[PDB]
Structures are given as C-alpha cells and as structure tokens.
Copies of this chain bind each other. A is one copy, B any other.
C-alpha cells in the first residue's frame, strides 16, 4: 500500500549543486562584506537559506519576517576574510581545511556564528597539540 523511498546521499548531491550555484553567483540573495583591520575588504555571495541552515546566528539574522527585495549587503567586522571563506565553504560542503596557525582564528569565527561542529573540531584538535 504505502510505498516509500529514501535516497541516502541526496543532501550531499544537492549541496554539491548549491555550492556550484554559489561559485557561479546564481540565485544568491546575500553579499557578505568582510573588513578586518589591515586586511583588504572581501565580498562573499551566498544564499541566506543555506547559511541559516548551518549557523543559528545567520538564521536569526535573516529571519525577520520580511521578504527583502533583491540583494542585501551584510557588513561583517571582527573576522578575517580568510576565516569567513572557510566557514562558508563548510556550510556548502560540510568540510573545512586550514593551517595549524589559523585554526584558532577559525574557532573564533565558528563560535561567533555558533557553528558547533566546527567549534568542537578545533577544540579537540588544539587539545591534541598540547604536551
């Protein structure tokens, strides 16, 4: 009677395309302007719904009961553009890479945007460096 089916890696497939659309700057509805001290400013286009799905801070930031028209620019301060890139990548790919020296700055970014899995990851790594 009730025929049901589930594609295992659909979400991984869909995020692949959603990442392709980001790199192609198609359907993006938010531009993240990152300005950090002495580093040059950098823009990052993305989809609010995707960022919200990976960061409770973005979710609350975009869920204001309003269908904002067209593009919305968000001014981000206190984080290095390099770091914001890795976090966006993680949101669209569920993965993140970096050098040992920037792990701490990524942890700060993960905390600032409450991306727990990244926080816990950098936490356990830093503890392993000890001794």
Contact = CB atoms under 8 A, between A and B. Distances in A.
Contacts of A65: 26
B4 A95 contact: yes
Interface residues of A, number: 52
A37 interface: no
Contacts of A91: 14
A3 B98 contact: yes
24 contacts: A3-B99, A3-B103, A5-B125, A6-B95, A7-B90, A7-B95, A7-B117, A7-B121, A10-B54, A10-B94, A11-B11, A17-B52, A18-B53, A21-B49, A21-B52, A21-B59, A26-B62, A26-B65, A27-B52, A29-B29, A29-B67, A47-B47, A49-B49, A68-B70
